[PDB]
Amino acid sequence: MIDLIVSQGRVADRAAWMIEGAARTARALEERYGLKGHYVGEPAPHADDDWSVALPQARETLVAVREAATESIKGDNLTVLVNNTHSVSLATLPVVAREHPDAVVLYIDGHGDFNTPETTDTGNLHGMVLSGACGLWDSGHGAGLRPEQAVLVGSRDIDEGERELIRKAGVRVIPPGEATAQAVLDAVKDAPVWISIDWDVLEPGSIPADYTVPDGMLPAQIRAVFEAIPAERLIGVELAELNAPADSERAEQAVAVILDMVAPAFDAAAA
Ligand SMILES: [Mg+2]
Ligand SMILES: [Mg+2]
Ligand SMILES: [Mg+2]
Ligand SMILES: [Mn+2]
Ligand SMILES: [Mn+2]
Helix, strand or coil: CEEEEEECCCCCCCCCCHHHHHHHHHHHHHHHHCCCCEEECCCCCCCCCCHHHHHHHCHHHHHHHHHHHHHHHHCCCEEEEEECCHHHHHHHHHHHHHHCCCCEEEEECCECCCCCCCCCCCCCHHHHHHHHHCCCCCCCCCCCCCHHHEEEECCCECCHHHHHHHHHHCCEEECHHHCCHHHHHHHHCCCCEEEEEEHHHECCCCCCCCCCCCCCECHHHHHHHHHHCCHHHEEEEEEECCCCCCCCHHHHHHHHHHHHHHHHHHHHHHC
């Protein structure tokens, strides 16, 4: 009753071990739940390139992830995507919004990812993912997510340009100190639910990502979200931005903590 899809192609990766982090996460899920993952994309080298170069390069991987996501979301299994980068959600979020136009997206992240090409100060595609899914700019991978149905959980590092786009579009923001069961249940109400996680939401030290931003959520708060959302309401889960080298302490300890955070959802789905 779980479908596991794993991105292994470069999607604007600036960090060296996002593909390895995704692989280690997927292999641990495979072992815990006796799943066989659908691995898509071919690894390319990381680089600090503009979105205008990285997005074109990522098309093949994004289209293969979209195709596998569409097949699983049309079906009766919990859709689980283990994505190297948050940018893969440029492909998955338009699918979820087309299949489930009633769905609320819990976008669990330390940042807003709501810059456009006009507002971005870094040219990092990652900073433009949720705005892209919401059609504030054209990613070439579709849009159709209503910002009124997107909830930023745990965001604490939002540019004033980005904050303006977020308020006007009607994206709700739950800061990390308010990100409890009550606040998340108030946000999703009675809607079906898609969870999109960027591990940079977590208080630094624990689960390595690309970005390090203080005063974040704790692993138990993420576990509380998975415990709080009813199994009948959960469409699927996306896990992104584990930057963990092959065979490392950060790999084995991060993946133990991830297994613990997602167990309330995956144990229910796996039965
Ligand atoms: Mg790195
Ligand atoms: Mg293209
Ligand atoms: Mg279902
Ligand atoms: Mn982030
Ligand atoms: Mn992100």
